[PDB]
Swiss-Prot record, chain A:
Function: Constant region of immunoglobulin light chains. Immunoglobulins, also known as antibodies, are membrane-bound or secreted glycoproteins produced by B lymphocytes. In the recognition phase of humoral immunity, the membrane-bound immunoglobulins serve as receptors which, upon binding of a specific antigen, trigger the clonal expansion and differentiation of B lymphocytes into immunoglobulins-secreting plasma cells. Secreted immunoglobulins mediate the effector phase of humoral immunity, which results in the elimination of bound antigens.
Ig-like domain: residues covered: 118-215
UniProt lineage: Eukaryota, Metazoa, Chordata, Craniata, Vertebrata
Protein's UniProt name: Immunoglobulin kappa constant
SUPFAM superfamilies hit by this protein: Immunoglobulin
GO MF, one example: antigen binding
Disorder cited: Immunoglobulin kappa light chain deficiency: A disease characterized by the complete absence of immunoglobulin kappa chains.
Main location per the UniProt record: secreted
Domain of life: Eukaryota
Length: 218, 219
């Protein structure tokens, strides 16, 4: 199989600025018929992939001029002249020289904007859920940028690990922000024997960490 | 434009078989180079195989050979993908596509089916439990609904029957350590609206025919 490798994997771009995505193949994509079957796709959020550029550098009909491809052999580059909101999504290179056909890992292009601190909210478990024998404690980070944030759970000022799941939205297409949930899961037994539940949040938009907490019952 | 139409979501147990379809609503099917490509849950594309219905030529990704079978019904313009002994790792969005004309022709297309979601799990259909994420006690408040322990995907969440859409964040589902999905849906609102407006999350889970409208209230 011909391994396709894309760099980078994440590409923040400021609207109107250029973007480059590189693809390297494990071996030459020159076919015995003389053609080089390296293609570039964009998969916008929720959609199927769409073809941008075929055989290295041929703009597919209907695709905007701002997209262009170059390269030869094993090294290939997709360039976007001036990035726009409609350009967001995962870009894949695709080889069809050799069976089995293969794809790069994907390069996620997102809109770059200034750092924006998250608004933090902590939610205790409902009593209806406490009848279940389980306690879910939820922490929300709302409308922040960049994606990267550290969420630490502290239980009676003791730092939790492996006990919570994070979930993150796709980039909000209108304000270029992300939101994130961290759900801490405890047995009804473990929940009912501690007092302070704190969501601890670190992020570039905050000089020093934000902690939001509640005490069980109050 | 000529497009491809695929059959509906599949939910299967490990060990079971599958059969999904891809009908061309266009054109001439017998000359197509039809590819099957699956997209993994947060992942890349895995190329499954290719069929030209005309010849019955088939090429298979070695990893899926003797699990996967490509066939074509030339009478109904429909391509099929059969798959036996499904494994949990076969959980993916499956696409059919026409991308390439015969080599040397210079002809390129971009027809994609809408996708068929395939879920392979030993878990059984279960409706979600919906729990309130209560607004606690400045300018803006956040509230929501915890949608827990359902199977399979998908679930749908709206707020106030669709009347409320601004500031809404419905998170992606996460597969929990149990075989079961969980998600939350939140909305930020002005704090001044709390005493004044009601907030109901409308959670619908078609696979189990469960509809839950949960009223979310302060404390």
């Amino acid at each position: 199989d011909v391994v396709m490798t894309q760099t980078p994997l994440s590409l923040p771009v400021t609207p109107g600025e250029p973007a480059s995505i590189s693809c390297t193949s494990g071996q030459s994509l020159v076919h015995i018929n003389g053609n080089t079957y390296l293609h570039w796709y964009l998969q916008k959020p929720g959609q199927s992939p769409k073809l941008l550029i075929y055989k290295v550098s041929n703009l597919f009909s209907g695709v905007p001029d701002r997209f262009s491809g170059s390269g030869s052999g094993t090294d290939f580059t997709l360039k976007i002249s001036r990035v726009e909101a409609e350009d967001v999504g995962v870009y894949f290179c695709s080889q069809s020289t050799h069976f089995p056909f293969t794809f790069g890992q994907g390069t996620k292009l997102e809109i770059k904007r200034t750092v924006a601190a998250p608004s933090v909210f902590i939610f205790p478990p409902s009593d209806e859920q406490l009848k279940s024998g389980t306690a879910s404690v939820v922490c929300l980070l709302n409308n922040f940028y960049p994606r990267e944030a550290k969420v630490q759970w502290k239980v009676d000022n003791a730092l939790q690990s492996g006990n919570s799941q994070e979930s993150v939205t796709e980039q909000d297409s209108k304000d270029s922000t992300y939101s994130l949930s961290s759900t801490l899961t405890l047995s009804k037994a473990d929940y009912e024997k501690h007092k302070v539940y704190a969501c601890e949040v670190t992020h570039q938009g905050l000089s020093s960490p934000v902690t939001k907490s509640f005490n069980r019952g109050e | 434009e000529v497009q491809l139409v695929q059959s509906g979501a599949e939910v299967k147990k490990p060990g079971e078989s599958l059969k999904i379809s891809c009908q061309a609503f266009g054109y001439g099917f017998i000359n197509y180079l039809i590819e099957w490509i699956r997209q993994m849950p947060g992942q890349g594309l895995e190329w499954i195989g290719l069929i030209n219905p005309g010849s019955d030529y088939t090429n298979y990704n070695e990893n899926f050979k003797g699990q996967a079978t490509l066939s074509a019904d030339k009478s109904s313009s429909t391509a099929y993908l059969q798959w036996s002994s499904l494994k949990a790792s076969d959980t993916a969005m499956y696409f059919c596509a026409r991308r390439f004309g015969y080599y040397g022709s210079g002809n390129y297309f971009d027809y994609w089916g809408q996708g068929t979601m395939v879920t392979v799990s030993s878990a059984s259909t279960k409706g979600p439990s919906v729990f309130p994420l209560a607004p606690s006690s400045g300018g803006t408040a956040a509230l929501g609904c915890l949608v827990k322990d359902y199977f399979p995907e998908p679930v749908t969440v709206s707020w106030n029957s669709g009347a409320l859409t601004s500031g809404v964040h419905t998170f992606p589902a996460v597969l929990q350590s149990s075989g079961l999905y969980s998600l939350s849906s939140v909305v930020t609102v002005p704090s001044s609206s709390l005493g004044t407006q009601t907030y109901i999350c409308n959670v619908n889970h078609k696979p189990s025919n469960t509809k839950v409208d949960k009223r979310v209230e302060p404390k």
